Amino acid sequence: ASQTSFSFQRFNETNLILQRDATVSSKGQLRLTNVNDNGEPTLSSLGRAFYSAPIQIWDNTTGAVASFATSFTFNIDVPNNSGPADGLAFVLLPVGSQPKDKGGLLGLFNNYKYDSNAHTVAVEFDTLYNVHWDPKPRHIGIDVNSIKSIKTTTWDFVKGENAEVLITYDSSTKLLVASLVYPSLKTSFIVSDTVDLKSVLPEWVIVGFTATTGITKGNVETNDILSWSFASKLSDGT
Amino acid sequence: ASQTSFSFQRFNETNLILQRDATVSSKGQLRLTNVNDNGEPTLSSLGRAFYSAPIQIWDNTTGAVASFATSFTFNIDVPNNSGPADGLAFVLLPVGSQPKDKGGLLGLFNNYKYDSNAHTVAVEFDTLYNVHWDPKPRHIGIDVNSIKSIKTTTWDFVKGENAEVLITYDSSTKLLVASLVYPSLKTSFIVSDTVDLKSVLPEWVIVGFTATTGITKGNVETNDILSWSFASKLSDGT
Amino acid sequence: ASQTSFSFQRFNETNLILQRDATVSSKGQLRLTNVNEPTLSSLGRAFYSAPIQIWDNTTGAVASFATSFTFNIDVPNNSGPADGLAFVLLPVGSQPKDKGGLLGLFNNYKYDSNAHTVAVEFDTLYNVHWDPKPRHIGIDVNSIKSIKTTTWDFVKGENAEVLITYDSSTKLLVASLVYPSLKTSFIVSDTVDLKSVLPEWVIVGFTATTGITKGNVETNDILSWSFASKLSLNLANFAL
Amino acid sequence: ASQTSFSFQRFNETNLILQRDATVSSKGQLRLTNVNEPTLSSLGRAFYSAPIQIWDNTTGAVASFATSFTFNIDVPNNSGPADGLAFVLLPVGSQPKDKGGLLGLFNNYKYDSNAHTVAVEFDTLYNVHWDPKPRHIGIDVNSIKSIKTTTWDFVKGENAEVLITYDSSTKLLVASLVYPSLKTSFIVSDTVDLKSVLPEWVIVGFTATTGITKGNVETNDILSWSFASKLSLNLANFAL
Ligand SMILES: CC(=O)N[C@H]1[C@H](O[C@H]2[C@@H](O)[C@H](O)[C@@H](CO)O[C@@H]2O)O[C@H](CO)[C@@H](O[C@@H]2O[C@H](CO)[C@H](O)[C@H](O)[C@H]2O)[C@@H]1O
Ligand SMILES: CC(=O)N[C@H]1[C@H](O[C@H]2[C@@H](O)[C@H](O)[C@@H](CO)O[C@@H]2O)O[C@H](CO)[C@@H](O[C@@H]2O[C@H](CO)[C@H](O)[C@H](O)[C@H]2O)[C@@H]1O
Ligand SMILES: CC(=O)N[C@H]1[C@H](O[C@H]2[C@@H](O)[C@H](O)[C@@H](CO)O[C@@H]2O)O[C@H](CO)[C@@H](O)[C@@H]1O
Ligand SMILES: CC(=O)N[C@H]1[C@H](O[C@H]2[C@@H](O)[C@H](O)[C@@H](CO)O[C@@H]2O)O[C@H](CO)[C@@H](O)[C@@H]1O
Ligand SMILES: *[C@@H]1O[C@H](CO)[C@@H](O)[C@H](O)[C@H]1NC(C)=O
Ligand SMILES: *[C@@H]1O[C@H](CO)[C@@H](O)[C@H](O)[C@H]1NC(C)=O
Ligand SMILES: *[C@@H]1O[C@H](CO)[C@@H](O)[C@H](O)[C@H]1NC(C)=O
Ligand SMILES: *[C@@H]1O[C@H](CO)[C@@H](O)[C@H](O)[C@H]1NC(C)=O
Numbered sequence: 001a002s003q004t005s006f007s008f009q010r011f012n013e014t015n016l017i018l019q020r021d022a023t024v025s026s027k028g029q030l031r032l033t034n035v036n037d038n039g040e041p042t043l044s045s046l047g048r049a050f051y052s053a054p055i056q057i058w059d060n061t062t063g064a065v066a067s068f069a070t071s072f073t074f075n076i077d078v079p080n081n082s083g084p085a086d087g088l089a090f091v092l093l094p095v096g097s098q099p100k101d102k103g104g105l106l107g108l109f110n111n112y113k114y115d116s117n118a119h120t121v122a123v124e125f126d127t128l129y130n131v132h133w134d135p136k137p138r139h140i141g142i143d144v145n146s147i148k149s150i151k152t153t154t155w156d157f158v159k160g161e162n163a164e165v166l167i168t169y170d171s172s173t174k175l176l177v178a179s180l181v182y183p184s185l186k187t188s189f190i191v192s193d194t195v196d197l198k199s200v201l202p203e204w205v206i207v208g209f210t211a212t213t214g215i216t217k218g219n220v221e222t223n224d225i226l227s228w229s230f231a232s233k234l235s236d237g238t
Numbered sequence: 239a240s241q242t243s244f245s246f247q248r249f250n251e252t253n254l255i256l257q258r259d260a261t262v263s264s265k266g267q268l269r270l271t272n273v274n275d276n277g278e279p280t281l282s283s284l285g286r287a288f289y290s291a292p293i294q295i296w297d298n299t300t301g302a303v304a305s306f307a308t309s310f311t312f313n314i315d316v317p318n319n320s321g322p323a324d325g326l327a328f329v330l331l332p333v334g335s336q337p338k339d340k341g342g343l344l345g346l347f348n349n350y351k352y353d354s355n356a357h358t359v360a361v362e363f364d365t366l367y368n369v370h371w372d373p374k375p376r377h378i379g380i381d382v383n384s385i386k387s388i389k390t391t392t393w394d395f396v397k398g399e400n401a402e403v404l405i406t407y408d409s410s411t412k413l414l415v416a417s418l419v420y421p422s423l424k425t426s427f428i429v430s431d432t433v434d435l436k437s438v439l440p441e442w443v444i445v446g447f448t449a450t451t452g453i454t455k456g457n458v459e460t461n462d463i464l465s466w467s468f469a470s471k472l473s474d475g476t
Numbered sequence: 477a478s479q480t481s482f483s484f485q486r487f488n489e490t491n492l493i494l495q496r497d498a499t500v501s502s503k504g505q506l507r508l509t510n511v512n513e514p515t516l517s518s519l520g521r522a523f524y525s526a527p528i529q530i531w532d533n534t535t536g537a538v539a540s541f542a543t544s545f546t547f548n549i550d551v552p553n554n555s556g557p558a559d560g561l562a563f564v565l566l567p568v569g570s571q572p573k574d575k576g577g578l579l580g581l582f583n584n585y586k587y588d589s590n591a592h593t594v595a596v597e598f599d600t601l602y603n604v605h606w607d608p609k610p611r612h613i614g615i616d617v618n619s620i621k622s623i624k625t626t627t628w629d630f631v632k633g634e635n636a637e638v639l640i641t642y643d644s645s646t647k648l649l650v651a652s653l654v655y656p657s658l659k660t661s662f663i664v665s666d667t668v669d670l671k672s673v674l675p676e677w678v679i680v681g682f683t684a685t686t687g688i689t690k691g692n693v694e695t696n697d698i699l700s701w702s703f704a705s706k707l708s709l710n711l712a713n714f715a716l
Numbered sequence: 717a718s719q720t721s722f723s724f725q726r727f728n729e730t731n732l733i734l735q736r737d738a739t740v741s742s743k744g745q746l747r748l749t750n751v752n753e754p755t756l757s758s759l760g761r762a763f764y765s766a767p768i769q770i771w772d773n774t775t776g777a778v779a780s781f782a783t784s785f786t787f788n789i790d791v792p793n794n795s796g797p798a799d800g801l802a803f804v805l806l807p808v809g810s811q812p813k814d815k816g817g818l819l820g821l822f823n824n825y826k827y828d829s830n831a832h833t834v835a836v837e838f839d840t841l842y843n844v845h846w847d848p849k850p851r852h853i854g855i856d857v858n859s860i861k862s863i864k865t866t867t868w869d870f871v872k873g874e875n876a877e878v879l880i881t882y883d884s885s886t887k888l889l890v891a892s893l894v895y896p897s898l899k900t901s902f903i904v905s906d907t908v909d910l911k912s913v914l915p916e917w918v919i920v921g922f923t924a925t926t927g928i929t930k931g932n933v934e935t936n937d938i939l940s941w942s943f944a945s946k947l948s949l950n951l952a953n954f955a956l
């Protein structure tokens with residue numbers, strides 16, 4: 001009924017909303033967090049990037065809820081003698097949303113409690129164990145209004161290898177499914193849970209990414225998006 | 239390579255940029271020009287509406303030019319004892335473009351001379367003969383940087399009948415083709431000419447509509463867009 | 477409940493049903509009529525190998541569809557063109573009928589309510605007994621006498637790009653042709669009731685013929701073809 | 717240079733090649749194995765009627781493709797499941813091989829470099845001589861002994877949604893299954909060199925079998941199916 005789709009193999013700032021440290025490089029890579037002139041990622045970085053047009057997720061007249069899917073390739077790399085931190089996430093957020101706290105909160109939250117007014121749904125690729133809320137192994141998590149994921153799966157993170165993600169949402173079943181594959185390693189990971197978008201999100205949202213680097217020396221990473229495809233469909237009744 | 243598409247059967251202001259008199263009605267119709275509380279169109283109206291995300295039309299590094307296509311249904315209706323004026327157009331314009339002069343200039347031009355800095359490509363559905371530049375019969379016209387169309391075809395306009403338009407641009411041949419059908423009348427019209435987008439338009443544009451009503455009593459119309467689908471593709475080299 | 481699409485920039489025999497003189501060249505072109513220079517009295521048809529459901533008697537639903545194709549009709553010097561080519565919807569298993577001006581679709585020029593034929597013709601030869609005098613695009617329903625035509629300013633050897641669309645909500649069949657090198661364009665539209673003409677399942681494809689009389693001959697080459705159908709279209713998406 | 721896609725929410729025989737016990741029910745379901753309650757020693761296969769080009773020897777190009785489908789495997793009380801179902805790519809004209817645990821695709825459990833078979837199996841029965849002990853999703857290349865498996869927590873009568881993707885630029889075949897009612901998900905991935913296994917043109921579809929021994933039986937119903945391939949994919953577009 002209403003349908004939107006886009007697909008980019010290279011990025012440009014013109015059709016993106018970039019926040020904080022997010023940049024588009026001369027190679028057309030979406031570099032969510034800061035990288036210095038030496039090619040090295042820096043500490044206490046936070047950036048977010050969204051598609052410039054809002055996307056309708058649900059309709060309060062008809063009660064319809066969109067189905068959507070997104071795919072993207074990302075590269076998280078780590079300097080020798082550091083470990084990675086903190087990760088990146090694909091997000092659906094209110095129009096006008098501004099960055100929240102950095103580090104392990106991923107620019108999405110101000111603390112680690114549930115916040116029913118966060119209006120945040122995200123799929124996180126978390127590279128740093130945060131003792132107060134995370135499982136110990138690195139993980140893909142489904143986040144609904146909290147940094148404490150409603151569901152996670154173990155992610156065997158490998159630095160500098162391109163990761164291909166597919167996230168799908170089927171509004172008939174309310175199932176959100178996230179998967180990651182490393183084509184060069186032939187490894188694959190998947191997590192799934194139900195999410196009630198209509199109870200969490202505004203009718204219109206912005207879609208895109210958030211990422212942070214570690215705040216403590218020895219915990220840092222690049223957070224580069226290399227390609228992105230999104231599609232959504234919302235029924236109108238004809 | 240870069241791809242964008244969207245399709246709406248009903249409209250909402252959230253993902254549109256609306257200028258001047260353009261509104262979205264409670265029925266989700268995009269009403270480009272003013273209609274009063276009696277359902278009657280008013281004189282000296284001008285409105286424009288665009289998709290909120292800019293669209294890349296060409297790339298100055300690779301030299302690639304997008305191919306695109308758009309379809310839409312419109313309804314132009316006229317009160318008894320008036321004739322129609324002035325028409326509507328599908329447009330590609332610079333990001334940030336503001337309305338120009340009203341009436342026969344369609345909110346796109348300031349006079350009827352060629353302006354090499356207008357950066358305007360439009361397909362017009364012109365319901366009012368303007369003696370200084372138009373063919374006498376109502377017409378579909380291809381407009382490049384001037385209200386004086388580079389090419390026109392006769393359009394047998396009928397008030398209040400839904401018109402379905404398809405406009406296509408093939409960057410390999412540079413051919414722009416515009417067609418209109420009235421499904422209820424079984425009539426159809428087509429016009430085609432080449433346009434060099436790279437020489438006329440900026441690399442990024444906004445896509446959408448402009449419309450005006452007559453400035454003189456007895457020349458007035460509604461200019462309602464009822465549905466709109468757009469798709470573009472720009473090669474990146476992989 | 478049902479969607480089908482395909483698009484070919486180069487052809488191969490494996491997924492086509494080829495009839496009579498229709499060949500796939502080694503350069504990937506679908507040459508519907510014979511080339512030894514084209515020859516006389518040729519008939520060729522070509523279809524996609526999977527049947528397409530266009531309507532359903534249990535639900536009443538009728539498909540919307542669209543097809544685009546590029547064709548090249550060329551003519552030898554000291555000859556004129558004949559007879560033309562058509563895009564067709566036919567019953568599963570259909571066999572070629574009569575040659576020449578009947579385009580391989582009919583036995584005679586009278587209406588036949590058992591032909592189960594819907595076609596869009598690109599007619600290069602004036603047949604005194606049924607055609608308009610100028611060369612034409614026509615919508616054919618169970619007869620070689622088109623229900624609707626438009627004038628087509630045929631030019632030999634120029635690539636022609638066709639778009640045909642059918643909207644089941646309005647019953648409107650629209651056919652357009654452009655010559656991108658010449659910047660010329662043509663369009664014809666009329667309603668067709670598919671429910672009452674075609675069987676529930678059809679084969680989609682092409683038919684073409686050359687003239688049976690010396691001096692009236694042409695090539696009938698299809699260079700690319702896309703098709704899409706939906707049964708319970710986005711024309712901006714399809715056209716691209 | 718070549719694209720093909722279809723999507724069915726309801727099935728019909730007209731555009732399918734059905735083999736052995738495979739039927740289309742009157743409610744539009746593709747029941748791959750026999751239901752009198754499912755019965756023993758059943759084998760059924762079903763294919764799309766048009767051949768799909770997966771690679772080309774003149775250009776070297778290999779297709780990328782994706783397929784999604786919903787299936788329901790159900791089991792009678794006082795019975796366990798067997799033997800499973802698979803999505804397959806096979807040579808044009810392929811005929812059913814042996815029943816039971818060989819899923820209608822092989823004669824024995826040894827590697828056969830002439831089977832020209834690429835399959836994704838949903839294996840419901842532990843075959844002592846080649847399978848892992850838990851029920852599994854497997855990638856089969858010219859053998860019933862999967863090159864790669866993942867554990868599948870099979871649950872009877874629950875709709876399962878499958879996505880299979882092949883990326884010709886990485887050679888990676890990925891297969892995932894979700895049970896939306898249970899919120900469970902499974903994934904397996906491995907590289908497959910299609911060029912060296914399959915002929916240039918293939919038929920795509922399904923195979924399924926029931927157990928040959930009392931107490932090991934199941935239905936193998938496909939409820940919907942979408943396929944897309946491209947030969948010179950957008951997974952966000954396809955999945956939707
Ligand atoms: C309490 C905690 O999680 N501490 C980790 C620290 O978190 C930051 C901040 O990112 C987080 O949002 C906030 C929540 O209140 O707490 C702190 O301010 O981040 C550092 C890395 O920058 C972690 O330290 C590293 O942890 C690794 C865990 O595997 C490993 O032990 C490293 O050696 C260590 O430096 C804090 O654990
Ligand atoms: C000169 C001219 O075109 N005049 C028509 C007038 O145009 C406006 C304005 O819209 C236009 O952009 C500008 C260009 O310099 O000129 C004028 O300011 O618009 C009116 C209608 O509002 C036309 O009058 C109507 O024309 C009809 C032509 O078929 C018909 O004659 C009507 O009876 C008449 O009122 C001016 O012709
Ligand atoms: C009567 C007529 O149409 N003559 C033209 C001729 O047509 C052929 C054939 O193509 C037609 O299908 C049948 C229908 O009766 O008639 C003739 O046999 O084709 C010639 C070129 O091949 C034209 O010059 C004739 O005018
Ligand atoms: C040896 C074995 O696998 N036994 C199981 C049996 O398998 C069948 C058949 O399905 C296999 O394809 C062939 C391969 O040699 O062996 C047997 O004939 O299936 C039973 C259920 O039908 C299992 O209980 C046996 O364990
Ligand atoms: C994006 O495109 C614009 C052209 O409008 C150009 O000015 C800008 O430098 C581009 N950015 C990058 C990172 O290439
Ligand atoms: C469009 O949607 C928004 C919901 O954010 C609503 O406030 C607004 O009234 C809608 N406009 C129309 C014309 O329906
Ligand atoms: C069609 O495909 C087969 C390979 O399967 C091959 O023999 C033939 O050359 C192909 N035809 C063309 C025109 O490429
Ligand atoms: C398949 O189509 C034919 C009509 O062409 C019909 O006889 C049959 O009922 C259809 N099958 C189903 C399951 O609808």
Ligand SMILES: [Ca+2]
Binds near residue numbers: 130134
């Ligand atoms: Ca963390």
Ligand SMILES: [Ca+2]
Binds near residue numbers: 342365366367368372
């Ligand atoms: Ca005018």
Ligand SMILES: [Ca+2]
Binds near residue numbers: 559577599601
């Ligand atoms: Ca004729």
Ligand SMILES: [Ca+2]
Binds near residue numbers: 841
């Ligand atoms: Ca087994």
Ligand SMILES: [Mn+2]
Binds near residue numbers: 147
């Ligand atoms: Mn986490």
Ligand SMILES: [Mn+2]
Binds near residue numbers: 372373377379385
């Ligand atoms: Mn004009």
Ligand SMILES: [Mn+2]
Binds near residue numbers: 622
């Ligand atoms: Mn004719």
Ligand SMILES: [Mn+2]
Binds near residue numbers: 837848852854860862
């Ligand atoms: Mn197995």
